[PDB]
Design goal:
The structure is a homodimer of 475-residue chains. By secondary structure, chain A is an alpha/beta fold. Chain A folds into two domains: 178 residues, NAD(P)-binding Rossmann-like Domain (Rossmann fold, 3-Layer(aba) Sandwich), CATH 3.40.50.720; 297 residues, 2-Layer Sandwich (Dihydrodipicolinate Reductase, domain 2), CATH 3.30.360.30. Chain A is 32% helix and 23% strand. The first copy, chain A, is globular and about 65 Å long. At the A-B interface, strand 14, strand 16 and helix 10 of A face strand 14, strand 16 and helix 10 of B. The structure holds nicotinamide-adenine-dinucleotide (NAD) (2 copies). Chains A, B: It catalyses: 2 putrescine = sym-homospermidine + NH4(+); putrescine + spermidine = sym-homospermidine + propane-1,3-diamine. Chains A, B: InterPro entries: Homospermid_syn-like_C, Sacchrp_dh-like_C, Sacchrp_dh_NADP-bd.
């Protein structure tokens, strides 16, 4: 039967019971020992309340806000007898503030995004840089510098960000092995960064193709997705953003850097969900992805940075999302951007509504001697239904990653604020893999210059096919 | 009963029997008196042959080519006893050469596109300008100058190009009434151009939204459309192209004009089916259209050009397509452009396969005192099935326009080479209207600057919402 990894000796407070909370709850119940009355879900939605009631779990129907979060969460997380676990799977709440509160009170913490308090993403007085995931991530890095060590809090540990950081490490090990390079696997950040440098990894796409399809066609004026519509649209309207590689020799006129922080990022002055990049996955082959900002675009590039003695970056990979969401989401973006406003309504596809498909999610490492290598999960909806309830394939990759991070945090409970890049990738993948379906590594000879130039002039760099100049879709 | 407009006494030579030929044949049989044995259908495909054989119509299984067209077509066109009618609904054939051959032999002629001989659309030695619909149309204008008058040949008389020219005239009449502009209805090209100028029509979109949906979801690696896949992809890979208004104050860096010809056009050095424009239809409301090149973008702008005594253009409207095809076609374009190559397979949706939807096809006249006015057809698939066989709503708008043009040609058989803009629009609409479903005029206060500027800096012209600078979507 299913492994029970650890006892949780305190309250389990799940903030948010949307598509990810609904998929994560059964995994927590399955894989951890605790008295049932220890678990409580907090979500303002009536829909969520009804589902929670049907699942027999405690539910508090309340929005967590800047004004109530201390009064609500401190008693809940400290109810005892020992250390609780805040499992934050919400929108509209501050990851930073909730994380800090959990830490101050000795509770473990995990989330899947650096979310801000409601109001931030559309605040007209914020400059684009301030709305970037680079800037949100810097608040977490600052919190870590301010209070090193202490109770473990895991930032951005879903499928992506999250699992994909573990895939990058496995992909690097595999690339080395496939070249006949043997020996000790890297242990330290610096060693991982040098492995990427030494292997000639110029950049990495988080290369995803969701092929899940519903039993009904996309309704007019309804945004359809396989996970948070609100969350997808919010990140989609943030600036396009990427970890920026040392090999790059061109950026768009509307690209901008940052004065401060880890140094690994640029952003573009346009919304990422209306920015296209040329990319590739094994099932899609060549496809457009949307250049939607993601925490790991920065965190992976930062993690794999090699600096010289003076502290100057001398190697860093480009890293960004290249997302092809489900067909109905593609249509939803075309509708939304074409209308200039959010649809009147939205819906998230339930497993009962999905007729077939997979969430093909992996990392595409390029520029090395074998050109490009994609490593990741090809989890299908049919396998999903066999192995975990109340979610689709998109959901299960995320919920199983939260499970893995929770196991890691319980096993390493004094590690301080950590990113997915800081965790033991082998342990995390050991926990997660039973929920990932086929996990495969595939080489390809495809590059962004395949078939180009066509019959129109274009600005391309034929000396270096994977340059962002060639990847970015431009007029 | 259905009106039988005229007897056709000579051969009826239908070149091509794909979606439009299949929809047009039954209308020809319905609306003209003739011995069925005088029909002949020419198409290279087995699929077409079996359909023709099922209708008990003479069929010749040949591709018409530059090498064979004279020897193949002349005996068919001249078989007698009376004047024949060449109904050209093909791909890969020269409209110009076939039209000239028909005229040389006294046969009436109609088509729905200025098609070139196979090889043109992908010829790598052609400069972009030479690949343009403007250039193709100029070959037709030159033929007309070289041989004025004579046997009628109707160029580009489908739904669009074709019908939409008649809609422009009706829309101008309606606007004049609604704006209280006095004067008699124009009866010459010069008078129509002056009316458009006097009404302050800055430009016109051919504003189309196809909402037809099939009973099966879009297959991976299959291009799906409601009419010619080959034809749509060919025009989609031609340069984006538009009739260019005198009111425009800006064009993109990759726009180009023409050194010769009617003077009415520009094109962009990028493919039209991967070029988006902000537009509007009554059912879509605000939407993206694709800026796919079309004959009428040039012909309507040219028709409505006012020149001074010296012959310099002092007024001309912008005119271009703003096409939102069916959702499966939108996905097909994303797939094709994302892959960098045509899909392995394609299919045209049959009425038996379509579950619901309309082809909302009209003209959006903007810049006048009531902002914007859309006039056109909202034909549904359900109405289509009630009134005509063997076609979907897209096909019926086209086949019924061909019918109208054929009636007009029989009633005006010595009018020379004519475009849809040259035909008597009321007679054509009188014939066509029974097949158009609801035909309506709708005003809107929408403009391309609605909601702008938003979250990011944009390169807009706030002085005039309808400038192309505001309409064109930048990547
Ligand atoms: N890293 C990844 O791989 C990954 C993947 C998917 C989702 N996510 C993130 O996880 C979060 C949840 O995604 P989802 O698909 O479950 O979203 P969802 O939209 O399905 O659910 C969000 C839930 O948050 C609740 N909520 C709203 N305001 C709240 C508040 N003030 N307090 C508490 N709850 C509140 C809503 O009622 C809703 O049930 C989102 O932030 C999303 O961006 C991360
Ligand atoms: N103006 C408009 O509104 C409008 C609308 C739709 C289509 N069209 C045009 O009408 C034409 C027909 O469209 P469709 O949807 O019927 O296309 P289709 O692709 O369904 O059919 C094209 C037919 O042409 C035949 N063909 C190919 N090569 C040939 C040759 N050398 N000689 C004779 N026949 C040949 C094919 O075998 C096929 O049956 C296309 O050129 C298209 O661009 C115009």
């Amino acid at each position: 039967d299913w492994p029970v990894y650890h006892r949780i000796d305190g309250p389990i407070v799940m903030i948010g019971f949307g598509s990810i909370g609904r998929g994560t709850l059964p995994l927590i119940e399955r894989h951890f020992a605790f008295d049932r009355s220890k678990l409580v879900v907090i979500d303002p939605s009536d829909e969520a309340r009804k589902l929670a009631e049907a699942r027999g779990v405690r539910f508090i129907q309340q929005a967590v806000t800047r004004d109530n979060y201390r009064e609500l969460l401190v008693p809940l997380l400290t109810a005892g007898p020992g250390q609780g676990f805040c499992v934050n799977l919400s929108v509209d709440t501050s990851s930073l503030d909730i994380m800090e509160l959990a830490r101050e009170n000795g509770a473990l913490y995990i989330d899947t995004v650096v979310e801000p308090w409601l109001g931030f993403y559309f605040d007209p007085d914020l400059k684009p840089e301030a709305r970037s995931n680079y800037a949100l991530r810097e608040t977490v890095l600052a919190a870590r510098r301010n209070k090193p060590g202490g109770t473990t809090a895991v930032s951005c540990c879903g499928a992506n960000p999250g699992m994909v950081s573990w895939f990058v490490k496995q992909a690097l090990v595999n690339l080395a092995a496939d070249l006949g390079v043997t020996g000790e696997e890297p242990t330290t950040r610096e060693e991982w960064a040098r492995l990427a440098m030494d292997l000639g990894v110029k950049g990495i796409h988080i290369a995803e193709r969701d092929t899940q399809r519903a039993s009904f066609p996309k309704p007019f004026d309804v945004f359809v997705n396989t996970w948070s519509v609100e969350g997808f649209v919010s990140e989609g309207l943030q600036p396009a953003e990427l970890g920026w590689g040392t090999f790059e020799r061109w950026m768009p006129d509307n690209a901008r850097g940052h004065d401060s922080g880890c140094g690994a990022g640029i952003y573009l002055l346009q919304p990422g969900a209306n920015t296209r990049v040329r990319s590739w996955t094994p099932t899609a082959m060549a496809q457009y992805g949307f250049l939607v900002t993601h925490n790991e675009s920065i965190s992976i590039a930062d993690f794999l940075t090699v600096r010289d003695a003076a502290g100057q970056a001398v190697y860093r990979p480009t890293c960004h999302y290249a997302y092809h969401p489900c067909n109905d989401a593609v249509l939803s973006l075309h509708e939304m951007f074409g209308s200039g406003k959010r649809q009147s309504d939205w819906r998230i596809l339930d497993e009962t509504e999905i007729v077939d498909g997979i969430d093909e999610l992996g990392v595409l490492l390029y520029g090395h001697g074998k050109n490009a290598y994609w490593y990741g999960s090809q989890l299908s909806i049919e396998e999903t239904r066999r192995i975990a309830p109340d979610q689709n394939a998109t959901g299960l990759q995320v919920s199983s990653a939260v499970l893995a991070g929770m196991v890691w945090a319980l096993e390493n409970p004094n590690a301080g604020i950590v990113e997915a890049d800081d965790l033991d990738f082998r342990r995390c993948l050991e926990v997660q893999t039973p929920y990932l379906g086929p996990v495969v590594g595939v080489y390809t000879d495809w590059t962004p210059l395949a078939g180009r130039p066509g019959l129109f002039p274009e600005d391309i760099d034929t000396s270096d096919p994977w340059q962002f100049r060639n990847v970015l879709v431009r007029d």
